[PDB]
Design a binder for this molecule. Structure first.
Ligand SMILES: CCCCCCCCCCCCC/C=C/[C@H](O)[C@H](N)CO
Ligand SMILES: CCCCCCCCCCCCC/C=C/[C@H](O)[C@H](N)CO
Lengths: 275, 252, 178, 58, 275, 178, 252, 58
């Protein structure tokens, strides 16, 4: 229970006190209250800065990527799909995270899996309930190269199984950084001779997910599309920075085209005219 | 009055007479690394007089049509004495700084500088899917220059003042520790900057800790008889510098 | 002027008679195009209701030998726009003298029917007009430039609030970021 | 092992119950009741602070 | 709450103390701390040897065997399947268990059952939900020889029934050895004249599982494939031994082909060259 | 040499001048091919992050009448590899004299940016170079063999840790074990 | 027994097993300069881990006909890491030392070295009214060599072992802090050497503080099957090194 | 019949609740909070122990 500050009453004044005259050249934001310039009354103010905290602002589930894979194909690479894990391919969650330079949060991951029967000649089937497998590979593990590969056993890797029609699968993930905060921006190189790649692509290194159908080759193609929802919780955030004006281009760099600073007015003084 | 300020760090002293105040970071003054936040196990190196002292960078000339300048700062002090040598022989470095910028005029000149100290100023490129060479992000003590329009050079930073090379609004760039050099009241701008990074110590070549930016909002202007050449001189002093992991000289 | 740094400079100079208008905008932190992309405009554009006072700080970036005066008026709505300095001095205003202390603060008071406005535009919660006028001209001596530049600032006071989350109207992507 | 704390209610006019069920601290719910702040490091970030009535750059 | 050891500070030394000189010929591992050779500072170290314990290392569910059986066939032996119970047919769980010679643990068994409609002419059916039966036979019990055999009654034997679409079936199993620990290796014979079989195949004797479809002959063949997941919990482990270098060959012996000790370098001294 | 027992023997003998390099490898317990299949390399290959110090013990298996000296240097990265004994003696080193006490211990100090490295190879968490040099030669009397053998050992100190489980990169099966 | 000795200075450790004892100077252990004996007025630089550590010089080969070797010692550590860099950037230096010399053999080899540490070893010239070049008094970490007879080279030291290059009797050269490397009992020789000069601090390029000398009295000898190559390896560690008067890099 | 014990949290900055529901000890959860050790039987497995500063084989 922390309220905002009340407005205290004031009266007429004539003295050498000057709250309105300041100097912003010291990098100092003036602490001028409205009871310093005009005559105000006493207002008991009951507003709470509640839904503006860093916890309430970021803790919302957000779609980060769409993953598509099928259940029977000629080519085996279209029967499973993978995704190198980053939060920088959807601009909403990325632009919400790029208010700060360093962040520290636990993650809550929820998958939403939907199935669509593809167009074929033999659509009149009776298919039992599909079961999907979502295997997480920590950085360095073995990579499956088919749906029938023996790396899908999950002897050590975390996994989750979902039968069609239930609630979405949900698990929590602790703070996984090797440093003390997830560096949203990294101004530096990868090699000590200042060559290689420039940006935050060196410090990503979070692992990658794998998706397949546990069932075998069916007699009709079905396209599965699973959506990943991240929810940052237990949040700490440091050293803020201005939001991005320009539209993004890629996931691995920060590059852009120059955009105008704001929308034009075509005049500079207001009037009671067509404004 | 409080407009006179004097700073002594080592064997170098700055006396100013039209200063404003001193911005100290995010309230934190630079201090050494404690044993609770320490990660490496061996004894650090604390020179404290041969290192913590003011180094004077190159002076840059400010015409009526100048747009801005930037310096990367664990890297602009590469060849400045025993700070640069202790950077070259160690693996882990950790320091705070004190950035003092001089620019003088008369009571007949007008203009206004903005001295920002931007942590993790990861800059864009001129061409979108292109790699930036290291000679354009930093050049040591020689400043790089913003441009007024959309620059499209090869292997270069996107140099436009209304995006600061980073893709944001340049008016919103005052969230960082900043001062103004207003030519009717100011003469100088002192910024004390502590160590801000995600790890307790870091290598001082592979990483760029922050970026000083000097951008003139109100353009320099004068009459038909006043002095034309107006320099801008930047002086920096590391604070609480310590070093870890001694090995041979090089960076590769 | 938005594709340069000139969009921040408010032109001001010596006038002919007196009492002309300098600039002007409407008090909409999040819908008005002037303070749309400001930091207060960004953070208020991730919200839907707002409440509390607003500081406006004006820094004079001219020469040390020049003087001048200005009238920084706030007018709550219900009437139209004040069309001269006589109609502007009937509202919440302040006379600012340019001297050693180089910046003034117009602290816009919270004057409202309800407790919260809307960040987007509607007729019901309209907030008013920020306007600026010449009290006396800019008197400058010889061999000094006449035209100078005012810079403007905005922030929130200690009684400020936001209530309802929504997505920003600025994020526009079409495909992914491969 | 239960904890009782107040709910988010309005002014001028509660006591829910929470029990943690998992062995890790990363399974707990979000801490959506920390309403404290300190803008002394963003506003007023200077040495030799100013007294708001003096000319301050006097 | 048990931390790792801190690093204590040290200074310059010149004396007859020699912590670096030792003799490893006594089978003794030197207890040399880095503060005995070089000058170190004081580091308050907060690391915890938590996820390296024998409980946290082995308690992960691991696939041990794949069991396949159908729902209608010409031959009755392909309508049910059986498995003699051992942990030595998948190399990951076997190589994790062969760090130690004797182990003592409770087991947690989870079955994952998936069904695939086989290819036929009459795939357009409407099949109700399959129900599977998993019957465990302790060593010595009667053996079913058909899907319609009367040994499937489970009057004394443990069993589990699973309807299609639910969560996977899970049960716990206590420590079942007739000795005091599961002998991972047995150096000895079966007969007292030192003939018979050589190895751990004498001490296996854990029983065997049986799998069938509770439903009768359907009008379309469906191939069921159930995967067994073991989870060793409540773990005690004794007398460690080096991990296996060579690839395994069989389940019942330990035999191999000789493999090189490590990967070659083709030089013996490093340099700043192409290394 | 890996398909014999000769892979453990470090050849050492009397030299011509002085100051040559004996052996060398990179400090990667779990990615370097030298200490890949060691017990520390196996247990670290069931993990993904590691932290703490490392002991290296060297046993001299020569004759009782032979003497010699060696320089056991550790060099944190950032530069390259030390190319002579002059560049090697600028790092963490120890001079070992061969006498009655037949084995020395080079205790590699934990010197790192972060708290944990990676077991697999990456450019960001590189750890350094273990190298060995001739301080003085092996002086041997008459009727005694000149070429002798050094054995090497590795273990962890009391401040050592591992964090993230994963599967070992060594297990490779194709079918079952019928 | 007391024959095992261990020395740790920084991140470098020497363990010996057939040592004899340690000679410590003239009884004085190296310590820092007090405020009563101090002359300059500004703060010194005390690195103490990046400087005070063992540096290994070149190994020299000892045949049956070798005569001797010498090294000048504020100058042989010119290019040895941060000691050499801190020598190049400062004007006044002050340090003690610890000289450890390795030479090993078997129980079938015989011989005897004399390790002397000679302060102010002002050496003669080969030609009497001739100037000596600096490349012959010192060469860095590469040793100069005495000769058995009267050497008469150009611009060179008079290299005769029975005068040690200084004009005295070489048998009387044991008044300085010395040890012997006798190959039937010894393996090494540790000499702790404090700062000995007429002034409290001195420049470390223009002055030579002392001179290590290794002269074999009993010649090296062995049978027809023993090992021929016998190296001699010298390792040095500065102690209590501090520095004064920081300026640019150079020596002229 | 409940038991309260601390959770696995980090340093420098809990109390879950567990109730056993089955009649056997083989149904209980894994004991993943025993962090103790003793390497005195693998390292230092000798008679007449050594004092780390003496030559020890003196
Ligand atoms: C199958 C069970 C495990 C599910 C694994 C899915 C996600 C694994 C990674 C957890 C979330 C990390 C996402 C990235 C966090 C930070 O936002 C980024 N480093 C950038 O800030
Ligand atoms: C149907 C309900 C009961 C389920 C029965 C399935 C498993 C029965 C045996 C329990 C697990 C024993 C597995 C072997 C344990 C040891 O690892 C091996 N003896 C080798 O170490």
């Amino acid at each position: 229970v922390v309220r905002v500050a009340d407005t205290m009453p004031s009266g007429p004044s004539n003295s050498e006190s000057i709250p309105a005259l300041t100097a912003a050249e010291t990098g100092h934001t003036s602490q001028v209250v409205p009871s310093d310039t005009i005559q105000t009354r006493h207002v008991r103010n009951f507003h709470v800065r509640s839904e503006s905290s860093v916890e309430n602002f970021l803790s919302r589930s957000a779609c980060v990527y769409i993953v598509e894979y099928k259940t029977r194909d000629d080519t085996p690479d279209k029967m499973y799909d993978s995704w190198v894990i980053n939060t920088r391919q959807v601009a909403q969650l990325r632009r919400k995270l790029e208010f700060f330079t360093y962040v520290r949060f636990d993650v809550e991951v929820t998958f939403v899996i939907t199935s669509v029967q593809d167009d074929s000649t033999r659509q009149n089937t009776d298919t039992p309930a599909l079961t999907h497998q979502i295997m997480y590979v920590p950085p360095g593990g073995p990579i499956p190269q088919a749906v029938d590969d023996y790396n899908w056993q999950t002897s050590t890797n975390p996994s989750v199984f979902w039968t069609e029609g239930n609630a979405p699968p949900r698990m929590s993930i602790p703070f996984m950084s090797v440093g003390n905060a997830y560096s949203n921006f990294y101004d530096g190189w990868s090699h000590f001779s200042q060559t290689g790649v420039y940006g935050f692509n060196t410090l990503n290194n979070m692992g990658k997910l794998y998706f397949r159908h546990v069932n075998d080759k069916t007699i009709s193609p079905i396209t599965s599309k699973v959506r990943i929802y991240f929810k940052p919780k237990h949040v700490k955030a440091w050293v803020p920075r201005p939001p991005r004006l320009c539209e993004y281009t890629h996931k691995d760099n920060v590059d852009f085209e120059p955009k105008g600073v704001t929308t034009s007015r075509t005049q500079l003084t207001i009037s009671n005219s067509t404004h | 009055s409080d407009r006179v300020r004097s700073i002594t760090l080592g064997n170098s002293t700055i006396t100013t007479q039209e200063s404003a105040n001193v911005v100290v970071g995010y309230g934190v003054w630079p201090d050494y690394l404690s044993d609770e936040e320490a990660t490496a196990e061996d004894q650090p190196t604390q020179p404290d007089v041969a290192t913590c002292r003011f180094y004077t960078l190159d002076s840059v000339s400010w015409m009526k049509e100048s747009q801005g300048w930037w310096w990367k700062f664990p890297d602009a002090l590469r060849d400045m004495g025993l700070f640069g040598q202790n950077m070259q022989y160690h693996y882990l470095g950790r320091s705070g700084y004190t950035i003092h910028v001089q620019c003088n005029a008369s009571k007949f000149h007008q203009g206004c500088l903005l001295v920002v100290c931007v942590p993790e100023a990861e800059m864009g490129a001129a061409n979108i899917n292109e790699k930036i060479n290291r000679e354009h992000l930093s050049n040591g003590e020689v400043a790089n220059t913003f441009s007024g329009t959309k620059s499209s050079n090869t292997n270069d930073v996107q140099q436009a003042v209304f995006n600061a090379g980073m893709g944001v609004a340049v008016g919103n760039l005052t969230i960082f520790p900043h001062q103004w050099i207003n030519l009717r009241t100011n003469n100088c701008a002192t910024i004390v900057m502590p160590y801000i990074n995600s790890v307790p110590m870091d290598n001082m070549f592979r990483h760029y800790n922050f970026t000083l930016m000097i951008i003139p909002f109100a353009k320099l202007d004068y009459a038909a008889g006043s002095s034309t050449y107006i320099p801008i001189t930047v002086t920096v002093a590391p604070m609480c510098a310590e070093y870890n992991g001694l090995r041979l000289a090089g960076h590769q | 002027n938005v594709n340069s740094l000139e969009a921040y400079r408010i032109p001001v100079h010596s006038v002919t008679e007196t009492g002309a208008q300098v600039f002007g905008f409407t008090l909409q932190p999040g819908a008005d195009t002037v303070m749309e992309r400001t930091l207060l405009g960004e953070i208020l554009n991730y919200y839907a209701n707002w409440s509390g006072s607003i500081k406006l700080t004006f820094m004079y970036c001219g020469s040390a030998m020049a003087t001048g005066k200005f009238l920084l008026a706030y007018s709550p709505p219900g009437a139209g726009v004040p069309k001269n300095r006589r109609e502007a001095m009937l509202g919440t205003h302040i006379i600012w003298d340019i001297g050693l202390q180089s910046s003034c603060v117009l602290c816009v008071p919270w004057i409202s029917q309800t407790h919260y406005r809307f960040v987007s535009k509607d007729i019901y919660t309209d907030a008013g007009f920020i306007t600026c006028w010449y009290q006396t001209s800019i008197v400058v001596p010889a061999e000094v430039q006449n035209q100078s530049v005012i810079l403007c600032f905005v922030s929130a006071c200690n009684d400020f609030s936001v209530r309802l989350l929504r997505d920003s109207p600025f994020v526009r992507q079409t495909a992914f970021y491969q | 092992g239960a904890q009782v704390s107040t709910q988010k209610t309005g002014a001028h006019e509660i006591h829910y119950t929470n029990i943690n069920y998992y062995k890790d601290a990363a399974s707990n719910s979000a801490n959506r009741q920390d309403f404290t702040q300190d803008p002394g490091k963003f506003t007023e970030p200077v040495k030799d602070i100013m007294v708001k009535s003096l000319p301050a750059l006097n």
